[PDB]
Structure 1
């Protein structure tokens, strides 16, 4: 149907905006602490601690398969990256501190992304 096509154009547009958001967020991680899944070879007990792992590579895979239906679902995954890290690692670690900085700097980006999604009506 034409309606289904229109929907898919909207999803494609959202995906384009979210790709830009994701790039901007990952720039705020120059250490690449959050670029890849935490390795279960180097951290074998990780899944005992964290029930829903997330990282930028995994987000990007879902993104390019148009797997985010709205900004909220994307934000959920971003929050998982930050929140998992702040649980697993202690406050005095480079990991925890990197998560705080990512959260603080990313909020700026996400604040405007929400306005843009609403404004352009991508949902």
Structure 2
């Protein structure tokens, strides 16, 4: 139908906007602490601690499958990255501190993405 096409075009354009959001958020992680999943070879007990692991590569796979239907879902995944890190790692660690900086700096990028998603519909 023409409606299904039009909806597909909306999802395509959301995917384009989220792709730019993801690139901007990941630049706020220059040390690449959140680039890939925590390794279960190197942290074999991770899943006893963290029930819903997340990282930027895993978000990128979901994005390119047009697997985010709205910005809320995308933000949920970003928030997991930060919140998982801040639980698993102690306050006095480079990991925790990197998460706090990512959260603070990403907030700005997400504040405007929310306006761009509401605005462009």
TM-score range, shorter chain: over 0.9
Q: Deviations over 1:3-45 (max 9, x none)?
A: 0000000000000000000000000000000000000000000
Large movers: runs of 4+ above 4 Å: none
Q: Which secondary structure does the structure 1 equivalent of 2:43 belong to?
A: coil
- In the alignment, structure 1 segments of 5+ residues that lack a partner are none
Normalised by the length of structure 1, the TM-score is 0.98
Normalised by the length of structure 2, the TM-score is 1.00
Distance 1:23 1:64 in 2: 13
Distance 1:78 1:40 in 2: 20
Distance 1:41 1:117 in 2: 39
Q: Which secondary structure does the structure 2 equivalent of 1:106 belong to?
A: helix
Specify the alignment match of 2:62 in structure 1: 62
- In the alignment, structure 2 segments of 5+ residues that lack a partner are none
Distance 1:99 1:45 in 2: 21
Measure how far apart 1:67 and its partner are: 0.1
Distance 1:92 1:72 in 2: 30
Q: Which secondary structure does the structure 2 equivalent of 1:83 belong to?
A: helix
